[PDB]
């Protein structure tokens, strides 16, 4: 992943084809409550990792804020556009 | 996916670049007990679609069962091999 928009490329290509092995069918399926939850614990992750952890530990919660932040974006039918208007 | 090892090789990928979406990483860091789980609550959902459900949603559960045992190979460090010699 080179820029946010890979990572958003490629999940909406996972929403598509619907891999087996794909989180983000299985979250798409299971409805925005869900994500509204899983996207708060990891804002809670980030701030215990920020701090108190490493510098690697902070990347990956926040990789994961990140990626969860995408996967609501595409439950809602956000595009990145939508989103990159308002910085 | 064309054959089983399409898949196989895909969650071998999945494994080594360890990307956000993969729930292959998320299940391979979390130890064989935990996949043995759910590979038995996947073949009770094979049973219960089997006896009672469409072929489509019997399909489902079964990619799924072929998901899960993919997994738990990687996880004990299998390969198609290991398995297909035995057929």
Known sequence: ???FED???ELGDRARTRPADSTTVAALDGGVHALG??????????WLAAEHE???ALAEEISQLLYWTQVL????GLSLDDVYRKL
Do not use: H
């Open 7 to 9: 990572l958003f490329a």
């Open 73 to 76: 974006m595409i439950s809602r």
């Open 54 to 56: 490493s510098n690697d």
């Open 1 to 3: 992943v080179k820029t």
């Open 37 to 46: 939850k899983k996207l708060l614990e990891e804002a809670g992750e980030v």
